[PDB]
Amino acid sequence: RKMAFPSGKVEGCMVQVTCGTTTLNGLWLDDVVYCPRHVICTSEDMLNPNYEDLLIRKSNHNFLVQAGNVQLRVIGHSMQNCVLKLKVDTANPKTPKYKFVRIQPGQTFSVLACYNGSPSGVYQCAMRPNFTIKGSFLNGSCGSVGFNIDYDCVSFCYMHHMELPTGVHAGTDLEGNFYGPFVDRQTAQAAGTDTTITVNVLAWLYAAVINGDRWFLNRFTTTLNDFNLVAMKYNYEPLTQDHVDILGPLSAQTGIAVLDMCASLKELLQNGMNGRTILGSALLEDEFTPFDVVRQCS
Amino acid sequence: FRKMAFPSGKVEGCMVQVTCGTTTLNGLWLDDVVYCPRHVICTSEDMLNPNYEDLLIRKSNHNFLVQAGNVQLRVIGHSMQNCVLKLKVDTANPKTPKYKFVRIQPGQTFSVLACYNGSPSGVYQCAMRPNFTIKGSFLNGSCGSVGFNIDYDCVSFCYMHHMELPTGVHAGTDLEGNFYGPFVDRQTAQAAGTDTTITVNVLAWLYAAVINGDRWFLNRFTTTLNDFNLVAMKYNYEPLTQDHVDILGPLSAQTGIAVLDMCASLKELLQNGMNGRTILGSALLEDEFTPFDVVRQCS
Numbered sequence: 001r002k003m004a005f006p007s008g009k010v011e012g013c014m015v016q017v018t019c020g021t022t023t024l025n026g027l028w029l030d031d032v033v034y035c036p037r038h039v040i041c042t043s044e045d046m047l048n049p050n051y052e053d054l055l056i057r058k059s060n061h062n063f064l065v066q067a068g069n070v071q072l073r074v075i076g077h078s079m080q081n082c083v084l085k086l087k088v089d090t091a092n093p094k095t096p097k098y099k100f101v102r103i104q105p106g107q108t109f110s111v112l113a114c115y116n117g118s119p120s121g122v123y124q125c126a127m128r129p130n131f132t133i134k135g136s137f138l139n140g141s142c143g144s145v146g147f148n149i150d151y152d153c154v155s156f157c158y159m160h161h162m163e164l165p166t167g168v169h170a171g172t173d174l175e176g177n178f179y180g181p182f183v184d185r186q187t188a189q190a191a192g193t194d195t196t197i198t199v200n201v202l203a204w205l206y207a208a209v210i211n212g213d214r215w216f217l218n219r220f221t222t223t224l225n226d227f228n229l230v231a232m233k234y235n236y237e238p239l240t241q242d243h244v245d246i247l248g249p250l251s252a253q254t255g256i257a258v259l260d261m262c263a264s265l266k267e268l269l270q271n272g273m274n275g276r277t278i279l280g281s282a283l284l285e286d287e288f289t290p291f292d293v294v295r296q297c298s
Numbered sequence: 299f300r301k302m303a304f305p306s307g308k309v310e311g312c313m314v315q316v317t318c319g320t321t322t323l324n325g326l327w328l329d330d331v332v333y334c335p336r337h338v339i340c341t342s343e344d345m346l347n348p349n350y351e352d353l354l355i356r357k358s359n360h361n362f363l364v365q366a367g368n369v370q371l372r373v374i375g376h377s378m379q380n381c382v383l384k385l386k387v388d389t390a391n392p393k394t395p396k397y398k399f400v401r402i403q404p405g406q407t408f409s410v411l412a413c414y415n416g417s418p419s420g421v422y423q424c425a426m427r428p429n430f431t432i433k434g435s436f437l438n439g440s441c442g443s444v445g446f447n448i449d450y451d452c453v454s455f456c457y458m459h460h461m462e463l464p465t466g467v468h469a470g471t472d473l474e475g476n477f478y479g480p481f482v483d484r485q486t487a488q489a490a491g492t493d494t495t496i497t498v499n500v501l502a503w504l505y506a507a508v509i510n511g512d513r514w515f516l517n518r519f520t521t522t523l524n525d526f527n528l529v530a531m532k533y534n535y536e537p538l539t540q541d542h543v544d545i546l547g548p549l550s551a552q553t554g555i556a557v558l559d560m561c562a563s564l565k566e567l568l569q570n571g572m573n574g575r576t577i578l579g580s581a582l583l584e585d586e587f588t589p590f591d592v593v594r595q596c597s
């Protein structure tokens with residue numbers, strides 16, 4: 001079961017930001033609202049926006065920020081990379097304990113998809129190795145954020161900016177730096193070749209075992225390097241020794257050595273499913289981390 | 299297409315914990331009432347075949363420990379309604395949303411806010427199977443977690459969690475304490491009926507495929523509803539009801555494909571198979587997206 005973090009602490013931070021005829025979402029923390037800077041663009045701007053030039057021509061009053069029924073007055077603005085920081089005269093009393101983090105490819109996070117400052121849905125995503133995310137985002141979703149929650153603390157890792165022609169998604173960390181080679185201009189952009197997140201496939205195979213499904217297992221083993229040669233051939237990410245270590249708990253819990261599971265995955269890559277399924281899926285799933293699998297079996 | 303849950307914040311604001319002795323589970327605090335599974339009053343020994351009426355007569359308001367976080371909520375009345383306990387408390391929950399209690403039909407989906415000790419752990423989308431089980435992710439201490447949909451301002455609570463079956467699927471009640479399906483809250487082995495495929499949701503999924511331009515499977519024929527239902531049953535698909543036909547109305551109107559024409563297309567897929575083709579990038583027909591889920595995601 002793909003499980004998202006409860007979204008309430010983030011919902012209390014979502015607001016609507018309008019500049020001209022463009023509306024998207026912002027993240028309101030203490031007295032600052034964070035949003036994608038392309039809100040300040042028009043059509044004649046989209047293709048090669050000189051953002052510093054476009055922004056110097058704006059006044060605080062060109063930014064309409066709405067939290068529910070209430071307008072928040074903008075008293076100052078600045079730009080950090082691809083994010084605009086709007087200072088407002090009110091502090092958000094619902095601001096959670098938080099930090100900004102930049103996540104690594106292969107890590108997972110929850111997305112709170114919003115439209116016109118209103119939360120619409122929540123789901124789990126992974127940062128792909130090619131730094132896209134396979135999200136569900138429509139017009140008006142920009143400024144939706146991705147996050148993880150640990151104890152009382154919300155770690156914001158993603159703010160949404162764009163869709164690629166292939167239907168995957170691209171965005172920034174909360175410092176406004178893109179994940180991947182993408183640019184906030186209105187042009188058709190391709191990503192690099194994606195690969196499958198191998199440590200996550202292995203965690204999901206252990207999950208299938210824990211839950212009684214183990215038809216894909218075999219009596220064989222493999223060395224780490226020989227597995228990695230096969231993985232790379234099938235556009236799977238290499239498995240590191242730290243990945244093996246990270247998988248220890250699941251290996252212990254099931255009594256299946258990591259390199260034994262690697263041998264099973266090799267067999268699946270070479271043979272296929274035989275038209276069968278694992279945990280319901282006809283495809284190998286790679287957006288559960290070892291931590292995810294552990295926490296949901298704990 | 300992915301399972302998308304509703305934002306959980308309005309339900310998070312309603313979760314509490316309810317303890318009787320050492321048995322702790324979750325409760326739902328709306329206005330000045332806390333709702334929770336009645337088996338909270340059972341010792342791990344009453345659970346074999348509890349006499350719930352006799353167990354409740356031995357309890358008093360002061361035997362129930364209700365906490366929102368570490369803050370005790372004083373209980374001032376208690377009653378049992380089917381398989382749920384209603385604990386009247388002396389504080390109205392200031393975070394009570396607009397809400398209603400609804401009893402859903404098989405095939406309908408809902409979000410579950412999985413909770414432990416009154417604390418939310420995660421949120422995910424579930425479908426009520428035709429055999430009245432859900433495939434949840436529930437561990438010990440999850441009972442009293444609820445399932446819900448949100449429409450406009452309003453939370454429609456439809457599920458409260460009570461138990462796991464031998465097979466690992468999950469069973470529970472509506473918020474009036476009436477179980478979905480033929481289950482009882484006793485620690486006995488109970489079997490669900492054989493499961494079937496949720497036809498109305500597969501049809502919704504075929505409509506979504508058409509909306510996205512994937513329409514190779516549309517054929518020139520049509521069928522009656524009765525003929526389709528009789529065929530569908532031979533493939534372990536649910537028969538359609540009139541309400542199913544109606545809730546496909548909007549997708550039929552969006553695509554211009556009559557419901558019964560889509561039924562004829564599905565019937566051909568059932569009888570002839572996919573012949574190696576995929577739909578929406580899948581050789582498997584998906585049955586856990588309702589017609590409303592398709593509208594939610596695509597708009």
Ligand SMILES: *[C@H](O)[C@H](C[C@@H]1CCNC1=O)NC(=O)[C@H](CC(C)C)NC(=O)OC[C@@H]1C[C@H]1c1ccc(OC)cc1
Pocket residue numbers: 024038041046137138139140141142143161162163164165169183184185186187188189
């Ligand atoms: C913000 O809400 C918006 C979210 C998008 C809209 C649909 N789904 C989403 O996730 N963001 C955008 O529309 C950005 C704005 C830029 C200034 C960063 N652009 C896009 O997401 O465009 C997507 C289309 C593939 C792009 C494309 C562009 C230009 C073409 O012609 C030369 C062709 C295709």
Ligand SMILES: [Cl-]
Pocket residue numbers: 522523524525
């Ligand atoms: Cl008929």
